Symmetry: D2
Subunit: 263 residues, 4 copies
C-alpha cells in the first residue's frame, strides 16, 4: 500500500499535469503564474480577476528594501560568501508573526470579528482589553503621514474587480479607528492581502465556505508573501554578489553587553 | 559615520516605493508583470515585454515536477511532521543546487563556454565524449525526436517566435541534432532549453553588455529562476499534505540496509 | 545613538573571551564541561556537577536514532542531492517540532500544569482523552512496552540516583502507567522524559527560583536539548551518505497515490 | 533492493546501538559526548585524549558573541518572534568560507603544503603570488595585539597530550610569517582546529593515512564548529526572548541606497 498521497501535480505521464490541467492546456488557456498558483495551491481554475490579483500581490510584496529582517539576513549570508539558496533561506526564516507572516492571522482575526457581528469599534476595544495585537495593523515606518502605496494599489484593484469586499470594508473601518489612536496603526500589506483573500475566496464562486475556511486555517495566505518576497531576497543576494561586499560583523558600539556578575 | 551596507534594487524610504528607479505605480501602469519586476529587482533593467513574458513562462514550467523529487519530498516530510509553511518550504529548498535543480545553471554555463570558445557543435560533442563528460541539459528518460517534451516545445516555440536573435539556442539545437543521431533520447531537455534561452535573452535583449550578462549567469541568476519557480510547487505540496491530513512519517525498516561496523 | 542590541551570554570584546561572567580559562580550570558551558550560555548559571552531567547524558542519548526518522531522512536526501553539510543538517533540523523531536517544551508545560494544579494522573489523562488533546511526551511509532526505550531507562536511572527530588518525573511515570495500560505504544518517550526531568532539575537544583525555571520552559529552552543533541547524529548521517557514495534520491512512484482532480 | 543505506546507528532492536556499541556500553565506558562523536562521525572508539580534545573544541567554539554573522542572524529571527529551530537555522546558514566554515579548507591547504615539502615562507609567498587566501588565517577583531585565548587553550592541550603535532607546528610557523606581514593574519580557531584534527586523525592509531585523508575530504572537520556554535546560537535565541526584544529594522542611515536613475 502506498505510504504517500498527492493531489496537485502528476509528472509521470506523456505530459506534465497541474491539478488535472495538462501543461499544454495551461498555456493554451493563458493562465499565467496566477492561474498556475490557483491550480497548484487551490486545485481550481480561478477567475481571471483572481489570477491577476494573485499576480499583483506577488508584485507588490516582491521587495521592501534591505533594512527589513529577512532582507538584512539574506544580505549577511551573501556577504558571508554563501550560496543563493542558503542566503535566501536565512532571510525567509525571519518571516512570521512580526514580519511578513501576519496574513493568516489577520484573515482569521478580522473574519472572526466580522462574522461574529461585532462592530469595528467593539473589535478594537476588545483586542485592547485582552492585550492582543491586531494582526495586519501596524508598521515600523509607514503611517498615515507616509502611506503605503502597495496598499493603495491593491485597494484600487479590489474595488474595480471584486464582486464583494465586505471584509476589506470592515478592516478599513477598523483602520480609521486605530490610526486615530496612533499614526503607525495602518492597515499594513499583510492585513490588506489577508482580508482581500478572504473576500476573494468566499465570493469568487470556486469555493464553498468550508473550503475557504480550510485554506485560511492550513496557511495558504502567508504563502503569498513568502513567494512574493523571495523575488526581492534573491535580488538582494545577487546585488550583494555584484557589489563584492565582504564579511559583515556588527559593530560593538551598537551592542549593550550586560553579563552576570559574581560568578 | 560611513554606511556599512550598500543596496541597488529597491528604495522604500519615500512616500512611494521604488523598484530599481521605477516607482511602484509606474510598474503597474507599464504592465510590467512579474517578469518585469524580476528584471528590475534582479537586474536593475526594464526588460522588453517578450523577455518579461519568457521569464514568466520559465517560472510556470518550473513551478512543480511532482512529489517524488528530493525537495518536494523533503517539504512533504516536514508538512507531515506538523511544521509551518516556511520551515517546510525551506527544508525542501535546501536540497537545491547540485544534483537537484542545478542543471539550468550547469547547461547555461556549459553551452556558453563552448560557444564562447569559438568551437563548432560537432567539436564540442566530440570534446565532451573524449573527456567522459555528459552534456548538461541534454537527455531525457523517455522523450525523443517526434515525441517531444511539451515544456521544451512550448518555450522553444515562444523563444523562436519572439526573440530577435537566438545564437546560443541555435547552437544547442545543432548539438541536439548530433546527440539524437547517437541515441534518440539525447534531446535538448527543459533544463537545457531554459538555460540557453535565458542566456540568449541576457545577451540579445539589448539591456546588457556581455560582461553584465556573463556576470549574472556566474553569480547564479538561473539558480534563482529554478528556486523561485519551484517554490510555488513546494508551497503547494505543503498545503496539499495538510489538506490530505497526512500524519507523521517514519521510513520503513524494510527499505533500509543497515551495515554498521563489527 | 543608543545601542540597538542587548546581550547577556558572552563577551568577546576583551583579550580573553568570557562566557556569562567567567573567563574561558576559568571555565576549563573549573572543569565545567559541555554541560557547564550550556548552563552558562543558556541559563547564565553555575549548575551542580550532577546537573551538568545530566545535560551531557541528554545530549548523548539524543545523538541519533537511525536514518528512518523525519529529520535524518531529510538530511540524508539532502546529502544525496550533493549538498553541503549545513544545508543538509538544516533540512533535517527543520522537521523538528510537535510530532518529531520537539515535544519537550509542551510536555514540560502540560505535565507541570497538571502536577501544580493537584490533578491526579487519571483525571489528567481522562480529561485529555475526553478532550481529544494529545498528551505531549507520550507515544512512539516503534518503541512501546513490548520494545522499551533504553534511552529512557538510562535517563530515569540517572535522575533517580542523582537528583535531590523527582516529583514531576514521578507524576509523569504514574501517567505512563495509565496510558500504556490502554495502548502499548503510549510510553513516556524521550521528549517526555527529558522534558519532565529538566523541569525537576531546574526547579530543585538550587540555581533557579520557580519563576526563573518557569520562564525558561516558557521561552523554549528544553526543545533546544534535543536539537543540539540530535544535530550530532544528523551530521553523522550527512558524512555517512558521502562515505557510502550514495547517489541522488527520488521517491518511488509505487509508494505514492496520485489523486488529482478530474 | 533497499533505497537507503546507513552505517552509524541501529535502533531496530530492543537496545539502541551507536556504530556497533550498545548504548549501555557507551555509558559503561564513560565515553562522553566526544566518544559518541567518535562513534557516529568516525566509526571508531577514539583514545581518551582525542575524545577530550573533541569536547574541548565544542566548548571553545560554543559562542563568540552576538556580532558575528550567524549569531546576529539568529538574534534577528528571535526578535522577529520566530521559533528556536528557525532562528538557529537562519544563523547556521551563514557558516561557510568566510565565517566558521574554514576548517575543512584549512586542513586541506595546510596538509597539502606540508606534504609537498614546501617550507612555510615559500607557502606564504606562493599563495600571495596566486592571489589565494590562506584558509584558517585571519580574523576581523582578534590579532597579534588581541590574541585568541581559545587558540591558546587548544594549543596547550595538543602540545601536552598529542603524540605528534607536525601539521600544527607547520601552521604555527606559517602564522609567525603571516602575522609579521599583517597583524590580523593569526591562525584562527578554524585553522587551529582543522590542523589539529589532521594531526589527531593521522597519529591517534585509529585510522590509516587513507582513512584520515578521506575524513578531511568528506567534510567532517567543519561539523565541529557547526555543532559547537549551535549551543551559542540557541543561547542567543533564548537570551533575546528573555530580554523581550522586539522586531528589529536596520537604520536607514547605515545603508547607502544607490539605485539606477
Ligand atoms: C509591525 C509592528 C511590529 C510594528 O510595531 P511598532 O511600530 O514598532 O510599534 P511598537 O511595537 O513600538 O508599539 C507601539 C504601540 O503601538 C501598539 N501597537 C503596535 N502594533 C499594534 C497592533 N497591531 N495592534 C494594536 N496595538 C499595536 C503597541 O501595543 C504599543 O502600544 P503602547 O504604547 O500601549 O505600549 C507591530 O505593529 C505588529 O506586531 N503588528 C502586527 C503584526 C503585523 O501585522 N506585521 C506585519 C507588518 S511588519
Ligand atoms: C537522462 C539521462 C539519464 C538519459 O541517459 P540514458 O539514455 O540513461 O544513457 P545511459 O546512462 O544508458 O548511457 C548511454 C549512452 O548515452 C550517453 N549519454 C547519456 N546522456 C548523455 C549526455 N547528456 N551527453 C552526452 N552523452 C550522453 C552515455 O555517455 C552513454 O554513451 P556510451 O554508450 O558511448 O558510453 C542522461 O542523458 C542524463 O543524465 N542527462 C542529464 C544531464 C544533466 O543535465 N545532468 C545534470 C546533473 S550533472
Ligand atoms: C509520536 C506519535 C506521532 C506516535 O503516534 P502513533 O504511534 O503513530 O499513533 P497514531 O497517531 O496512529 O494514533 C493511534 C491512537 O493512539 C492515540 N495516541 C497517540 N499518541 C497519543 C498521545 N500522545 N496522547 C493520547 N493519545 C495518543 C491516538 O489518539 C489514537 O487513538 P484512537 O485509537 O482512540 O484514535 C504520537 O504519539 C504523538 O504525536 N505524540 C505526541 C508528540 C510527541 O511526544 N512526540 C515525540 C515522539 S516522536
Ligand atoms: C576572516 C577574514 C574575512 C577577515 O578578514 P579581515 O581581517 O577583515 O581582512 P580584509 O578582508 O580587510 O583584508 C585585509 C588584507 O588582509 C589580507 N588577508 C585577509 N585574510 C587573509 C588570508 N586568510 N590570507 C592571506 N591574506 C589575507 C587581504 O588579502 C587584505 O590584503 P590587501 O590589503 O593586500 O588587499 C579573512 O581573514 C578570511 O577570509 N580568512 C579566511 C577564512 C577563515 O579562515 N575564516 C575563519 C575566521 S572568521
Amino acid at each position: 500500500p502506498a505510504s504517500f498521497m498527492t493531489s496537485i501535480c502528476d509528472e509521470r505521464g506523456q505530459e506534465l499535469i497541474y491539478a488535472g490541467m495538462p501543461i499544454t492546456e495551461v498555456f493554451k488557456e493563458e493562465m499565467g503564474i496566477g492561474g498556475v498558483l490557483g491550480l497548484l495551491w487551490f486545485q481550481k481554475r480561478l477567475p481571471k480577476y483572481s489570477c491577476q490579483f494573485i499576480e499583483m500581490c506577488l508584485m507588490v510584496t516582491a521587495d521592501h528594501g534591505p533594512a527589513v529582517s529577512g532582507a538584512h539576513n539574506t544580505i549577511i549570508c551573501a556577504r558571508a560568501g554563501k550560496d543563493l539558496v542558503s542566503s535566501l533561506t536565512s532571510g525567509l526564516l525571519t518571516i512570521g508573526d512580526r514580519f511578513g507572516g501576519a496574513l493568516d492571522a489577520a484573515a482569521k482575526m478580522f473574519s472572526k470579528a466580522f462574522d461574529s457581528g461585532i462592530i469595528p469599534m467593539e473589535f478594537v476595544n476588545k483586542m485592547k482589553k485582552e492585550g492582543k495585537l491586531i494582526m495586519g495593523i501596524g508598521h515600523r515606518v509607514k503611517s498615515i503621514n507616509n502611506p503605503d502605496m502597495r496598499v493603495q494599489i491593491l485597494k484600487d484593484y479590489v474595488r474595480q474587480h471584486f464582486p464583494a469586499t465586505p471584509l476589506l470594508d470592515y478592516a478599513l473601518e477598523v483602520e480609521k479607528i486605530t490610526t486615530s489612536k496612533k499614526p503607525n496603526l495602518i492597515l499594513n500589506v499583510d492585513g490588506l492581502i489577508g482580508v482581500a483573500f478572504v473576500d476573494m475566496l468566499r465570493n469568487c464562486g470556486s469555493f464553498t465556505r468550508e473550503e475557504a475556511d480550510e485554506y485560511i486555517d492550513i496557511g495558504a495566505l502567508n504563502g503569498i508573501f513568502v513567494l512574493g518576497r523571495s523575488m526581492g531576497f534573491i535580488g538582494h543576494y545577487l546585488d550583494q554578489k555584484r557589489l563584492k561586499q565582504g564579511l559583515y560583523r556588527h559593530p560593538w558600539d551598537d551592542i549593550s553587553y550586560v553579563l552576570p556578575e559574581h560568578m
